RNA sequence: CCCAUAACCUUUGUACCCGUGAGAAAGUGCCGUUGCUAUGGCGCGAUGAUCUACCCAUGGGUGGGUACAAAUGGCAGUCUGACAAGU
């Protein structure tokens, strides 16, 4: 079927990390220009999309005293910015340079919505190719798994304890060559389930999640008639919920 | 030495200032404005653990700053602290004012006060980069000209070369200095008077300050870097010098 | 205003009220509301004295000019105040000039709402002249002559 | 007899009424100096009577300039009128404490019946006012002294240096570094769109070299199927048909074996190409603006070498100041060609210094320098 | 209201005296000539004082120096003839800026100090 | 989590490469204008003269570097494995 293309999925994840990196440095450049103008914005807020939308909205401190900024930022931060506009440390900046800052903030908003759209494409395509995995573990870490170890069938060929490892291979091989403790989580730290758990429970949830994920993966990549819903994924999730609930409900301090 | 070696940092007796030890030794401080070199000075940087963020430290040029000899020569107590406010009579440029901003850190403030315009241009652009430094471009003999801009500063530094030195430090200290305050002077014999000897000029000036109700704790000669100076560290007491 | 309203509504020591107002405009010229209440108090003293002269005649434009000159120094002071309120390129200066003039003339229409009434506003209009705003003005001219 | 003192703040003015004047003859004693230190007795000495703040930042700047020169402002005259009682010019002049012995004459020539005092008594009391500061004002003064201080400091320094925006160059630094990052990302997105559509058309990947015609082509041609004669014609209105590339791409579109991509890969490579083309338009516009600001600030640089080369030079310099301060002997720009470059480096140093310190340039001397450059070129 | 930026020029008398001292420095190797060398000398910190002319084509080439001279508190004076300055320098061409360098081992050290004192008075 | 989302080498793609400070070169030199000889321009410079591997007779192929690109090249191999928790 013309929807099953792992090379497009791995191109997507590589593109995703690069896009985040370049968005960060572009927001840096915008911050530096409007810090040659007026820096208290850059010292109060840091979130790039909101900062750039302020730049799109108002363009000078008098305009800021004129304008309202309710929907971009909460109002106490808004009025603190207004007080900074009323007592700035800044110059006034020329017309053409105002135009260029406007064009740059337009670029930033476009990249942010673009990245959200690309993540939408990634998630829908993930559910199209390997649905049980997306029901169980999360599409971000799913793409990252396939991207680290190559492609679908090879990731299926490898077994469960390896899947619990996959990430921290450097720490692994150093630890085994120096005879120390093996690492437990590796890459599966970024799952919502391990985010629910805590501590030694995180270790146990890590191996359990890797195992049921390995069942999901082997059923997912090597089946003839995949229903494309993921009931196997859902049942693995339910059993994982039972296990996590019981292990968190178990008490350690005496009663 | 070269731009590649690995070195170890160390907190000093004075706060803020750190020792950079490697094969050779250096005096270093923490930089607020990252990645930017002011006057071509070689800079160290470290990772620090969120992933670790990168902070940057800067060498304090001992042949160039007329305060650098203070710490290397070793003053018993420098009143510049990581929370106080410093009045600065005679910021030539970043060459010292940026470093005093870096040792006083984020919460503190520094008032640069200077008169000649083009250093004023470099000053204001540098403050435009770094937000704890406020420059004032007026003559250093009239705090009555600029008395709306400074509120109760904690320690005064001065490196002016004009012959008015004792009187102008007396004026600015009596205006804006806190009681039990600190004062640091960098005095040059050639720019006060030539024919009489340097140490006699030193005695004359320290006697002038004792007349102006600032009791001197100690002096340093700063021999190995520049010839014939003194750094005087004293205390504004205002009430019973004895 | 509270001071003036007390001293006028209970006592009507209009002279002390006026000196209060003079120093009030001196402290805060910037307040269009304060200008508003002063013009109101002027007109109220005028109509009080005119009803007094009328009841004098019954028991038996200088004021408009001082109103319009108060309006004059009002407009000049407000314009200068909002110029100095963020006083800088050529196009910046032109656009902010147009903004300021919009501001002042919006406020002038506010005074028209506060309202020889026709002659007073006609003086406002020749004062005004000496786009769509131009149409608004000539609209006010012809509708005022119909009034 | 020191009845009133007058303090000024980064927000506004204030006047205080004295209650208990200190006995002066002991003003060099440890005890009266500790009373000037501690809060415990200072509020016994001084009470608040009035305080009128400024209403605007430009107003604060102008009034501060006014005091600093020594003339009295309108706010100050109004405050004095509403505060000081009606005293005489022959007996019992009302006594106002004031920090500025040179401001004294203007107040005396303004109000006839007030004697200014700048004694060490007054220096003492006003010093105490500065120390106990905001803690005395009972909550009236709103907005930070610190922020008002900092804003007024920047404004006063700028107004007395006669700051500009034209003689700034940080715009040049940041704009050129942004330009470098844009071109880096535009070529890497060229490579990514090249492969990521070459899974549909490696024939295109080899046929068309330019990144912009690549993006324009994956704009116009959707996939290797929906291709027609008017598509070939608008491709001729695009890149060309006369190169034969149109015939080659339609026949390779007939014979191509890569996956006919579906609707979603289709829309995604579409959104990718549109994003890349928008960034290209922005980069071209910003480059043109960089040429503009170079002809604005330091066009002797564009006169002697060129816009982006002078701009790369200023960015290596850190600022126009440092380009000037660098000497004509350790300049690094980019045996015999070494002679030529040494020479033009010296000329560029002269150009940088003149267009730095000079307000507006001399491109006639730029022409002299460039024509001398071509004259030494026709020498060697 | 603002000065021309070659502030300050000197008397004809101080011009005569300065030209003699720079000529004797040209004799004794402690004069270095040329604005480029003046800049490098200020960076090395081995510059004692600076003569400048006020007539070259134009004067911002020479005007870059006051920043460095005030940066390291170095006395710098002005003379109105680059050709008279070159004649003092004993060179084939007019000079616009000259540096008297540092040596305490000199024959004219006292005269250098005397004229430097004169400069600091007139500043 | 400190980075296998890389780091280093190696293989291929892009490059040019051996601060000093007064010494270089050694009627006419080459033209222009005007006729019953007059003559137009220039002939060093402080604002800076000069110093910063290997072959083949102003070509290539070896030789080595740093700033940039690709590698399904290399270092380079994927944890343990039957009890636990309540009564």
Curated annotation (Swiss-Prot), chain A:
Subunit structure of this chain's protein: Interacts with SIK1/NOP56 and NOP1. Interacts with the trimethylguanosine synthase TGS1. Component of the ribosomal small subunit (SSU) processome composed of at least 40 protein subunits and snoRNA U3.
Localization per Swiss-Prot or TrEMBL: Nucleus, Nucleolus
Span of domain Nop: 129-249
Superkingdom of this protein's organism: Eukaryota
Crosslink site: Glycyl lysine isopeptide (Lys-Gly) (interchain with G-Cter in ubiquitin): 127
Residues of the full protein shown: 155 to 409 of 511
Stated role: Required for pre-18S rRNA processing. May bind microtubules.
UniProt record similarity statement: Belongs to the NOP5/NOP56 family.
Note: Present with 34700 molecules/cell in log phase SD medium.
Protein name per UniProt: Nucleolar protein 58
Swiss-Prot record, chain B:
Region ranges (S-adenosyl-L-methionine binding): 95-96, 114-115, 139-140, 159-162
Enzyme Commission code: 2.1.1.-
UniProt entry tagged with the keyword S-adenosyl-L-methionine: yes
GO CC annotation terms, alphabetical: 90S preribosome; box C/D methylation guide snoRNP complex; nucleolus; nucleoplasm; small-subunit processome
Highest taxon in the source lineage: Eukaryota
UniProt-annotated location(s): Nucleus, Nucleolus
Coiled coil location: none
Subunit structure as annotated in this protein's UniProt entry: Component of box C/D small nucleolar ribonucleoprotein (snoRNP) particles that contain SNU13, NOP1, SIK1/NOP56 and NOP58, plus a guide RNA. Interacts with snoRNA U3. Interacts with MPP10, NOP58, SIK1 and SOF1. Component of the ribosomal small subunit (SSU) processome composed of at least 40 protein subunits and snoRNA U3.
Name assigned to this protein: rRNA 2'-O-methyltransferase fibrillarin
From Swiss-Prot, chain C:
GO molecular function: identical protein binding; snoRNA binding; U3 snoRNA binding
One CC-aspect GO term: nucleoplasm
Entry's localization field: Nucleus, Nucleolus
Main location: nucleus
GO biological process, one term: maturation of SSU-rRNA from tricistronic rRNA transcript (SSU-rRNA, 5.8S rRNA, LSU-rRNA)
Mapped HAT repeat ranges: 12-44
Record's keyword terms, sorted: Nucleus, Repeat, Ribonucleoprotein, Ribosome biogenesis, rRNA processing
Family as reported in the entry's similarity comment: Belongs to the UTP6 family.
Function: Component of the SSU processome, a pre-ribosomal particle required for the maturation of the 18S rRNA from the 35S pre-rRNA precursor.
Oligomeric form and interacting partners: Component of the ribosomal small subunit (SSU) processome, or 90S pre-ribosomal particle, composed of the 35S pre-rRNA precursor, the U3 snoRNA, and at least 40 protein subunits. Component of the PWP2/UTP-B subcomplex composed of DIP2, PWP2, UTP6, UTP13, UTP18 and UTP21. Interacts with U3 snoRNA. Interacts with MPP10.
Leftover remarks: Present with 7520 molecules/cell in log phase SD medium.
Protein name: U3 small nucleolar RNA-associated protein 6
Upper lineage: Eukaryota, Fungi, Dikarya, Ascomycota, Saccharomycotina
Recorded name of the encoding gene: UTP6
UniProtKB/Swiss-Prot annotation, chain D:
General remark: Present with 13500 molecules/cell in log phase SD medium.
Location in or out of the cell: Nucleus, Nucleolus
Function: Required for 60S ribosomal subunit synthesis.
Outcome following mutation: residue 331 to A: Reduced growth rate at all temperatures
Main location: nucleus
Annotated GO CC locations: 90S preribosome; box C/D methylation guide snoRNP complex; nucleolus; nucleoplasm; nucleus; small-subunit processome
UniProt record similarity statement: Belongs to the NOP5/NOP56 family.
Gene Ontology terms, MF aspect: mRNA binding; snoRNA binding
Source organism of the structure: Saccharomyces cerevisiae (strain ATCC 204508 / S288c) (Baker's yeast)
Effect listed in the UniProt record for changing residue 350 to R: Reduced growth rate at all temperatures
Classification lineage: Eukaryota, Fungi, Dikarya, Ascomycota, Saccharomycotina
Subunit structure: Interacts with NOP1 and NOP58. Component of the ribosomal small subunit (SSU) processome composed of at least 40 protein subunits and snoRNA U3.
Residues the record lists as Phosphoserine modifications: 319
Keywords associated with the record: Nucleus, Phosphoprotein, Ribonucleoprotein, Ribosome biogenesis
Protein's GO biological process: box C/D sno(s)RNA 3'-end processing; maturation of SSU-rRNA; rRNA modification; rRNA processing; snoRNA guided rRNA 2'-O-methylation
Identification of the protein by name: Nucleolar protein 56
Shown part of the complete sequence: 3 to 415 of 504
Domain Nop as annotated: residue spans: 297-380
Recorded superkingdom: Eukaryota
